Amino acid sequence: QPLVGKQILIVEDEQVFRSLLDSWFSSLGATTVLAADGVDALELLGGFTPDLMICDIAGLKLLEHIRNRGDQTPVLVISATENMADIAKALRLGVEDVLLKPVNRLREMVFACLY
């Protein structure tokens, strides 16, 4: 129960991986909010602030819009992308890390971000 009291927003289009992340974070004690759609998640963020957001940048629009409004919400990107320029854009916007999928290292990044 290392993550009790932490709220995680998971933005993931793929139902299986969405459920996997929910199961993993929830098993650690976090309360999860999941959005299948990145545009839906942007709307959600206009009403609440999680301790960490996970998203795939294959997603940068969501990130650029929250960073331009002044939001300091921690973001971890999990993507299979091999596009260095895209990773670079995410890194410039401010992300905790960019994890390759299909995923481990996730535990490391999450804990090394939350506290």
mmCIF file of the C-alpha atoms, coordinates in Angstrom:
data_MODEL
# 
_entry.id   MODEL 
# 
loop_
_atom_site.group_PDB 
_atom_site.id 
_atom_site.type_symbol 
_atom_site.label_atom_id 
_atom_site.label_alt_id 
_atom_site.label_comp_id 
_atom_site.label_asym_id 
_atom_site.label_entity_id 
_atom_site.label_seq_id 
_atom_site.pdbx_PDB_ins_code 
_atom_site.Cartn_x 
_atom_site.Cartn_y 
_atom_site.Cartn_z 
_atom_site.occupancy 
_atom_site.B_iso_or_equiv 
_atom_site.pdbx_formal_charge 
_atom_site.auth_seq_id 
_atom_site.auth_comp_id 
_atom_site.auth_asym_id 
_atom_site.auth_atom_id 
_atom_site.pdbx_PDB_model_num 
ATOM 1   C CA . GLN A 1 1   ? 0.000   0.000  0.000   1.00 0.00 ? 1   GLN A CA 1 
ATOM 2   C CA . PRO A 1 2   ? 2.841   2.441  -0.806  1.00 0.00 ? 2   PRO A CA 1 
ATOM 3   C CA . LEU A 1 3   ? 0.579   4.780  -2.781  1.00 0.00 ? 3   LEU A CA 1 
ATOM 4   C CA . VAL A 1 4   ? -2.278  5.372  -0.350  1.00 0.00 ? 4   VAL A CA 1 
ATOM 5   C CA . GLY A 1 5   ? -3.561  8.929  -0.599  1.00 0.00 ? 5   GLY A CA 1 
ATOM 6   C CA . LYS A 1 6   ? -2.143  9.449  -4.102  1.00 0.00 ? 6   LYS A CA 1 
ATOM 7   C CA . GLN A 1 7   ? -4.397  10.113 -7.064  1.00 0.00 ? 7   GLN A CA 1 
ATOM 8   C CA . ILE A 1 8   ? -3.319  8.899  -10.504 1.00 0.00 ? 8   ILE A CA 1 
ATOM 9   C CA . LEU A 1 9   ? -4.790  10.002 -13.838 1.00 0.00 ? 9   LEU A CA 1 
ATOM 10  C CA . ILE A 1 10  ? -4.257  7.401  -16.566 1.00 0.00 ? 10  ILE A CA 1 
ATOM 11  C CA . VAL A 1 11  ? -4.893  8.453  -20.154 1.00 0.00 ? 11  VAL A CA 1 
ATOM 12  C CA . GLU A 1 12  ? -4.754  5.364  -22.346 1.00 0.00 ? 12  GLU A CA 1 
ATOM 13  C CA . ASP A 1 13  ? -6.583  4.454  -25.545 1.00 0.00 ? 13  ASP A CA 1 
ATOM 14  C CA . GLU A 1 14  ? -5.995  0.686  -25.398 1.00 0.00 ? 14  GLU A CA 1 
ATOM 15  C CA . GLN A 1 15  ? -8.519  -1.017 -23.112 1.00 0.00 ? 15  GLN A CA 1 
ATOM 16  C CA . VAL A 1 16  ? -6.253  -3.892 -22.056 1.00 0.00 ? 16  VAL A CA 1 
ATOM 17  C CA . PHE A 1 17  ? -3.317  -1.670 -21.074 1.00 0.00 ? 17  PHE A CA 1 
ATOM 18  C CA . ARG A 1 18  ? -5.718  0.805  -19.488 1.00 0.00 ? 18  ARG A CA 1 
ATOM 19  C CA . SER A 1 19  ? -7.035  -1.990 -17.242 1.00 0.00 ? 19  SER A CA 1 
ATOM 20  C CA . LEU A 1 20  ? -3.502  -3.230 -16.544 1.00 0.00 ? 20  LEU A CA 1 
ATOM 21  C CA . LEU A 1 21  ? -2.373  0.186  -15.306 1.00 0.00 ? 21  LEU A CA 1 
ATOM 22  C CA . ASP A 1 22  ? -5.553  0.610  -13.243 1.00 0.00 ? 22  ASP A CA 1 
ATOM 23  C CA . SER A 1 23  ? -4.984  -2.780 -11.632 1.00 0.00 ? 23  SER A CA 1 
ATOM 24  C CA . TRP A 1 24  ? -1.327  -2.040 -10.860 1.00 0.00 ? 24  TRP A CA 1 
ATOM 25  C CA . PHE A 1 25  ? -1.803  1.438  -9.369  1.00 0.00 ? 25  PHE A CA 1 
ATOM 26  C CA . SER A 1 26  ? -4.934  0.389  -7.482  1.00 0.00 ? 26  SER A CA 1 
ATOM 27  C CA . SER A 1 27  ? -3.137  -2.624 -6.012  1.00 0.00 ? 27  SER A CA 1 
ATOM 28  C CA . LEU A 1 28  ? -0.559  -0.214 -4.597  1.00 0.00 ? 28  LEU A CA 1 
ATOM 29  C CA . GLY A 1 29  ? -3.224  1.836  -2.822  1.00 0.00 ? 29  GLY A CA 1 
ATOM 30  C CA . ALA A 1 30  ? -3.636  4.773  -5.219  1.00 0.00 ? 30  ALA A CA 1 
ATOM 31  C CA . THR A 1 31  ? -7.021  6.065  -6.325  1.00 0.00 ? 31  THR A CA 1 
ATOM 32  C CA . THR A 1 32  ? -7.195  6.044  -10.090 1.00 0.00 ? 32  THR A CA 1 
ATOM 33  C CA . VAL A 1 33  ? -9.037  8.083  -12.676 1.00 0.00 ? 33  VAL A CA 1 
ATOM 34  C CA . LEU A 1 34  ? -8.891  6.667  -16.181 1.00 0.00 ? 34  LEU A CA 1 
ATOM 35  C CA . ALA A 1 35  ? -9.718  8.354  -19.450 1.00 0.00 ? 35  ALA A CA 1 
ATOM 36  C CA . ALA A 1 36  ? -9.821  6.514  -22.735 1.00 0.00 ? 36  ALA A CA 1 
ATOM 37  C CA . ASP A 1 37  ? -9.662  9.801  -24.628 1.00 0.00 ? 37  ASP A CA 1 
ATOM 38  C CA . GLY A 1 38  ? -6.958  12.475 -24.408 1.00 0.00 ? 38  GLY A CA 1 
ATOM 39  C CA . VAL A 1 39  ? -9.426  15.244 -25.185 1.00 0.00 ? 39  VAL A CA 1 
ATOM 40  C CA . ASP A 1 40  ? -11.692 13.986 -22.400 1.00 0.00 ? 40  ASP A CA 1 
ATOM 41  C CA . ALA A 1 41  ? -8.677  14.033 -20.076 1.00 0.00 ? 41  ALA A CA 1 
ATOM 42  C CA . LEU A 1 42  ? -7.930  17.657 -20.953 1.00 0.00 ? 42  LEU A CA 1 
ATOM 43  C CA . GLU A 1 43  ? -11.485 18.554 -20.007 1.00 0.00 ? 43  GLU A CA 1 
ATOM 44  C CA . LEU A 1 44  ? -11.173 16.592 -16.734 1.00 0.00 ? 44  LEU A CA 1 
ATOM 45  C CA . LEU A 1 45  ? -8.030  18.472 -15.767 1.00 0.00 ? 45  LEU A CA 1 
ATOM 46  C CA . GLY A 1 46  ? -9.989  21.715 -15.866 1.00 0.00 ? 46  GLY A CA 1 
ATOM 47  C CA . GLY A 1 47  ? -11.656 20.423 -12.725 1.00 0.00 ? 47  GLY A CA 1 
ATOM 48  C CA . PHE A 1 48  ? -9.124  18.366 -10.779 1.00 0.00 ? 48  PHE A CA 1 
ATOM 49  C CA . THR A 1 49  ? -5.410  17.859 -10.175 1.00 0.00 ? 49  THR A CA 1 
ATOM 50  C CA . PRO A 1 50  ? -3.934  14.387 -9.767  1.00 0.00 ? 50  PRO A CA 1 
ATOM 51  C CA . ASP A 1 51  ? -0.603  13.669 -8.087  1.00 0.00 ? 51  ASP A CA 1 
ATOM 52  C CA . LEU A 1 52  ? 0.604   12.101 -11.351 1.00 0.00 ? 52  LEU A CA 1 
ATOM 53  C CA . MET A 1 53  ? -0.651  11.727 -14.910 1.00 0.00 ? 53  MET A CA 1 
ATOM 54  C CA . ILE A 1 54  ? 0.331   8.866  -17.189 1.00 0.00 ? 54  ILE A CA 1 
ATOM 55  C CA . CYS A 1 55  ? -0.157  9.234  -20.938 1.00 0.00 ? 55  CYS A CA 1 
ATOM 56  C CA . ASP A 1 56  ? 1.087   8.105  -24.347 1.00 0.00 ? 56  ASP A CA 1 
ATOM 57  C CA . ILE A 1 57  ? 2.448   10.739 -26.726 1.00 0.00 ? 57  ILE A CA 1 
ATOM 58  C CA . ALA A 1 58  ? 1.414   8.621  -29.702 1.00 0.00 ? 58  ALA A CA 1 
ATOM 59  C CA . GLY A 1 59  ? -0.790  13.134 -26.204 1.00 0.00 ? 59  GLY A CA 1 
ATOM 60  C CA . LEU A 1 60  ? 1.638   16.022 -26.661 1.00 0.00 ? 60  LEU A CA 1 
ATOM 61  C CA . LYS A 1 61  ? -1.332  18.314 -27.268 1.00 0.00 ? 61  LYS A CA 1 
ATOM 62  C CA . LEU A 1 62  ? -2.729  17.441 -23.855 1.00 0.00 ? 62  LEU A CA 1 
ATOM 63  C CA . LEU A 1 63  ? 0.707   18.086 -22.340 1.00 0.00 ? 63  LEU A CA 1 
ATOM 64  C CA . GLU A 1 64  ? 1.328   21.373 -24.150 1.00 0.00 ? 64  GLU A CA 1 
ATOM 65  C CA . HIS A 1 65  ? -2.091  22.722 -23.161 1.00 0.00 ? 65  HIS A CA 1 
ATOM 66  C CA . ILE A 1 66  ? -1.695  21.973 -19.453 1.00 0.00 ? 66  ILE A CA 1 
ATOM 67  C CA . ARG A 1 67  ? 1.877   23.307 -19.399 1.00 0.00 ? 67  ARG A CA 1 
ATOM 68  C CA . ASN A 1 68  ? 0.847   26.501 -21.197 1.00 0.00 ? 68  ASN A CA 1 
ATOM 69  C CA . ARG A 1 69  ? -1.821  27.186 -18.562 1.00 0.00 ? 69  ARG A CA 1 
ATOM 70  C CA . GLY A 1 70  ? 0.826   26.959 -15.843 1.00 0.00 ? 70  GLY A CA 1 
ATOM 71  C CA . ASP A 1 71  ? 0.021   23.501 -14.484 1.00 0.00 ? 71  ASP A CA 1 
ATOM 72  C CA . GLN A 1 72  ? 2.898   21.774 -12.677 1.00 0.00 ? 72  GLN A CA 1 
ATOM 73  C CA . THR A 1 73  ? 1.176   18.368 -12.565 1.00 0.00 ? 73  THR A CA 1 
ATOM 74  C CA . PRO A 1 74  ? 3.818   15.617 -12.785 1.00 0.00 ? 74  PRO A CA 1 
ATOM 75  C CA . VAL A 1 75  ? 3.588   13.637 -16.027 1.00 0.00 ? 75  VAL A CA 1 
ATOM 76  C CA . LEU A 1 76  ? 5.043   10.251 -16.936 1.00 0.00 ? 76  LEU A CA 1 
ATOM 77  C CA . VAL A 1 77  ? 4.901   9.306  -20.609 1.00 0.00 ? 77  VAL A CA 1 
ATOM 78  C CA . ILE A 1 78  ? 4.709   5.633  -21.540 1.00 0.00 ? 78  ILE A CA 1 
ATOM 79  C CA . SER A 1 79  ? 5.118   5.137  -25.273 1.00 0.00 ? 79  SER A CA 1 
ATOM 80  C CA . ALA A 1 80  ? 6.462   2.669  -27.829 1.00 0.00 ? 80  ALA A CA 1 
ATOM 81  C CA . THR A 1 81  ? 7.585   5.597  -29.986 1.00 0.00 ? 81  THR A CA 1 
ATOM 82  C CA . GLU A 1 82  ? 11.124  5.661  -31.360 1.00 0.00 ? 82  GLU A CA 1 
ATOM 83  C CA . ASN A 1 83  ? 10.728  9.228  -32.609 1.00 0.00 ? 83  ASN A CA 1 
ATOM 84  C CA . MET A 1 84  ? 13.518  11.167 -30.882 1.00 0.00 ? 84  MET A CA 1 
ATOM 85  C CA . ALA A 1 85  ? 12.044  14.529 -31.880 1.00 0.00 ? 85  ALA A CA 1 
ATOM 86  C CA . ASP A 1 86  ? 8.713   13.667 -30.210 1.00 0.00 ? 86  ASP A CA 1 
ATOM 87  C CA . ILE A 1 87  ? 10.383  12.421 -27.053 1.00 0.00 ? 87  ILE A CA 1 
ATOM 88  C CA . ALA A 1 88  ? 12.362  15.664 -27.148 1.00 0.00 ? 88  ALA A CA 1 
ATOM 89  C CA . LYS A 1 89  ? 9.189   17.756 -27.345 1.00 0.00 ? 89  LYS A CA 1 
ATOM 90  C CA . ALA A 1 90  ? 7.759   15.968 -24.306 1.00 0.00 ? 90  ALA A CA 1 
ATOM 91  C CA . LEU A 1 91  ? 11.010  16.420 -22.404 1.00 0.00 ? 91  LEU A CA 1 
ATOM 92  C CA . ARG A 1 92  ? 10.988  20.180 -23.160 1.00 0.00 ? 92  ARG A CA 1 
ATOM 93  C CA . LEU A 1 93  ? 7.433   20.489 -21.891 1.00 0.00 ? 93  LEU A CA 1 
ATOM 94  C CA . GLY A 1 94  ? 8.485   18.913 -18.617 1.00 0.00 ? 94  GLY A CA 1 
ATOM 95  C CA . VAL A 1 95  ? 7.892   15.208 -18.066 1.00 0.00 ? 95  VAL A CA 1 
ATOM 96  C CA . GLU A 1 96  ? 9.262   13.029 -15.273 1.00 0.00 ? 96  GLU A CA 1 
ATOM 97  C CA . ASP A 1 97  ? 10.412  10.407 -17.777 1.00 0.00 ? 97  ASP A CA 1 
ATOM 98  C CA . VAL A 1 98  ? 9.599   8.626  -21.051 1.00 0.00 ? 98  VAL A CA 1 
ATOM 99  C CA . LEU A 1 99  ? 9.097   4.872  -20.621 1.00 0.00 ? 99  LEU A CA 1 
ATOM 100 C CA . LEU A 1 100 ? 9.117   2.441  -23.556 1.00 0.00 ? 100 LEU A CA 1 
ATOM 101 C CA . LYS A 1 101 ? 6.208   0.008  -24.042 1.00 0.00 ? 101 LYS A CA 1 
ATOM 102 C CA . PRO A 1 102 ? 5.026   -2.705 -23.942 1.00 0.00 ? 102 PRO A CA 1 
ATOM 103 C CA . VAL A 1 103 ? 6.723   -2.170 -20.561 1.00 0.00 ? 103 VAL A CA 1 
ATOM 104 C CA . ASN A 1 104 ? 9.409   -3.153 -14.214 1.00 0.00 ? 104 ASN A CA 1 
ATOM 105 C CA . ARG A 1 105 ? 10.931  0.286  -14.743 1.00 0.00 ? 105 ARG A CA 1 
ATOM 106 C CA . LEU A 1 106 ? 7.432   1.663  -14.186 1.00 0.00 ? 106 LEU A CA 1 
ATOM 107 C CA . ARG A 1 107 ? 7.708   1.116  -10.427 1.00 0.00 ? 107 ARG A CA 1 
ATOM 108 C CA . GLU A 1 108 ? 11.010  3.000  -10.404 1.00 0.00 ? 108 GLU A CA 1 
ATOM 109 C CA . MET A 1 109 ? 9.684   6.001  -12.342 1.00 0.00 ? 109 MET A CA 1 
ATOM 110 C CA . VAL A 1 110 ? 6.434   6.233  -10.389 1.00 0.00 ? 110 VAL A CA 1 
ATOM 111 C CA . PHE A 1 111 ? 7.959   6.127  -6.911  1.00 0.00 ? 111 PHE A CA 1 
ATOM 112 C CA . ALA A 1 112 ? 10.882  8.300  -8.002  1.00 0.00 ? 112 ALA A CA 1 
ATOM 113 C CA . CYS A 1 113 ? 8.240   10.838 -8.999  1.00 0.00 ? 113 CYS A CA 1 
ATOM 114 C CA . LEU A 1 114 ? 5.508   10.762 -6.357  1.00 0.00 ? 114 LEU A CA 1 
ATOM 115 C CA . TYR A 1 115 ? 7.846   10.914 -3.361  1.00 0.00 ? 115 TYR A CA 1 
# 
